[PDB]
Amino acid sequence: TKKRRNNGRAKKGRGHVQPIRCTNCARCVPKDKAIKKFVIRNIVEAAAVRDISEASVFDAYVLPKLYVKLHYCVSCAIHSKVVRNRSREARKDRTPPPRFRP
Template sequence: MTKKRSNRGRSKGGKGHSSLVQCTNCGRWVPRDKVKKVTSRLSLVDPSLAKELRASGAYIASPTVIKYYCVSCAVYYGVVKVRAEDERKSPEPLR
């Protein structure tokens, strides 16, 4: 049978099963090694006020928000791009 991707769409290697997580957008249950994980920081303070507080020496905490997307939602939101067949099968170069 033909092989579309060299890693079969997962990053688990040969370890068997992996736990499931729920997609942040649609709620689909997806294996943890297949989801697209997006980490961002959430600012709780207005930027102009934060600048003044930092100047006075205050520490401003910003919580980390982790979102998990299934492949279809990740493509829809532009987290990942659809790649051509030859780009898909070869590993991406390190940046």
């Protein structure tokens, strides 16, 4: 059965879509098909900030970040458990999951 009207990709008016290799398994994936992560991590640990701030020779030395763009085929994405299967109704919504800010 046609599981998604989306057909698992964003290709609507496009005839062809250039491919992008997976980061983990190193496999070609269609570009809009692959789930794209944009991690902005701390360049240090959460607990390393206290030790770094002492060694830093600047008083108000702001902490750099880590701007990495990640590409996952759904095989590596499920293995990393970044995406999960949803029910038939729960599959429909396209909003991002909550950000856990508070």
